[PDB]
Amino acid sequence: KYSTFYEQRATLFEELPVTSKDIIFLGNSITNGCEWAELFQNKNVKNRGISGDICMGVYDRLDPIVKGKPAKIFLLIGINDVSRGTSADKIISEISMIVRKIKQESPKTKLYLQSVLPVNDCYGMFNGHTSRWQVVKQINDLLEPLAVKEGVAYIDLYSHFVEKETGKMNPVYTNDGLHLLGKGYLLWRDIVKPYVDQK
Amino acid sequence: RKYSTFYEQRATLFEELPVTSKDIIFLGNSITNGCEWAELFQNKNVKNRGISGDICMGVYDRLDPIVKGKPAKIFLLIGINDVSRGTSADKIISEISMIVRKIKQESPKTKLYLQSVLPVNDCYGMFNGHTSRWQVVKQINDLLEPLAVKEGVAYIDLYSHFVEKETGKMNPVYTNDGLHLLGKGYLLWRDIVKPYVDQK
Ligand SMILES: [Mg+2]
Ligand SMILES: [Mg+2]
C-alpha cells in the first residue's frame, strides 16, 4: 500500500497527541525535512511530514491529526503525484478530498493551502519530478481557486522560490532541484510566520 | 548522492537554528532523524539533530553548530551506517571517542549520554549490509560501555530492551524493516531514556 518509512512515521504520529493549540505542517519530504518548532520558536508547531507522501497517503492518515482539532494545518503536497505522471486537475481533485475531510472532521481548524514549490532539473536528480517542472504552475493555477471555493487560505510560496526567467526553482534554495537547504526554510519561515502568528 | 545532498540539507538547516544552554539534543542517523523528540518527551527543550544516512565522521564534522550553544544534554546514537560500510567495531569506537572528546573539550558543561547501538534483524530481507551484520552491534556495545566509563560519560543500554530472547536481533514488534523503528519502538526508547532527559 505505502512505504515502510510511511508506516514508521504514521505509526509514530498515532502515538503523539494533537491538541486544540497545535499548528501542524502536513506534507511530503519538503515538510518532513524541517524542525518546525525551532524554525518558528513555537512549541505548538508540529511536523506531520513524511518523505515520499502523495495526496492519497495524506488523506489516509488524517484521523490522528483531525481528531485533536488542531488550531492550524499548513498543507504542502502533490509533487510526488506529479512524478507519477498524474495531471494537475487529478491532483487538485485529491487535494479537494483532503480539504473537505479536514473541514468536516475539524471545522474550527484554520487550513492553509501552500503553493506547490517549483523544481529544477539543473542537478540531474529526481528526473520524474524535475522534468515535469511545468506541472507546478498548472497545479497552483487550480489550487488558488480551490482555496477560494472552500473558504480556506492560499499561500503563494512559489513566487518567492521561482526564477521569473525559467519557471524553475532558484538553485540558491536547493542542492538537488526538489528539496530545500537551510536558506530555503528561512525563506519559507519569512513568508508563513505572519500566518503561524495570526489569531 | 541522495544521502550526501540530504546531509547538506539537514546540516545547513541546523546552522540556522540556534542551540541554547537549556537544550537537550538527540544526535545521530535515521533512527534519531525519524522521531519528533519534543512531542515524545512533551518537552520544548528537546531538539532533533538526526540525519538519515549519517556516520560517525559525519556527526563529528557537524558538531560546531550544536556544541557552540553549550547544550544541557546530548544523547548520541551513531554507528550502524558505519557497520553497513564494513567498518570494524574498533574503528567505529575510535571515531565515537573523537566525538566524545570534542564535545567534552568544546562544551565541558554538556552532559553526554552514549546510547547503545540498536540491534537489527535480517527477517524482512531489507537493508542487508546492515541487518546481515547483526553480530557487529554487540561487538560495538561491548567496547562502547568501557569507553563511556573511561571518558566519565553515561552509557544507556537500549539494546537489551529491543533485542529478542538470545538471538541478538531486534524484536520484530519494534520494526517493519529490521533497522528503523515503528511508533511502538520510539515509545520503548522514550520509556528508557525519559529519566535521563528529566535529570536536574
Ligand atoms: Mg544550490
Ligand atoms: Mg514488525
Author numbering:
A (entry chain DDD): 24 to 222
B (entry chain AAA): 23 to 222
List sentences from the manuscript.
Here, the crystal structure of a 9-O-SAE from Phocaeicola vulgatus (PvSAE) is reported. Structural characterization revealed PvSAE to be a dimer with an SGNH fold, named after the conserved sequence motif of this family, and a Ser–His–Asp catalytic triad. Therefore, bacteria employ esterases to make acetylated sialic acid more accessible for cleavage by sialidases.
A crystal from the Apo I condition diffracted to a resolution of 1.44 Å and had P1211 symmetry, while a crystal from the Apo II condition diffracted to 2.06 Å resolution and had P61 symmetry. The most significant difference between the Apo I and Apo II structures was the positioning of the most N-terminal residues (residues 24–27) of the first α-helix. The result of this change in conformation is that one active site is more accessible and has an ‘open’ conformation, while the other is still ‘blocked’ by the N-terminal α-helix. We suspect that this conformational change may be important for the accommodation of large, complex glycans that contain acetylated sialic acid. The high resolution of the Apo I structure allowed the identification of a malonate molecule in the active site of PvSAE. Malonate is positioned such that a carboxylate functional group is within hydrogen-bonding distance of the oxyanion-hole residues Asn103 and Gly75. As the most N-terminal α-helix of the Apo I structure has different conformations, the two active sites accommodate the modelled 9-O-acetylsialic acid in a different conformation. In the ‘open’ active site, the 9-O-acetylsialic acid is positioned such that the 2-position projects towards the bulk solvent, indicating that this site could accommodate larger glycans.
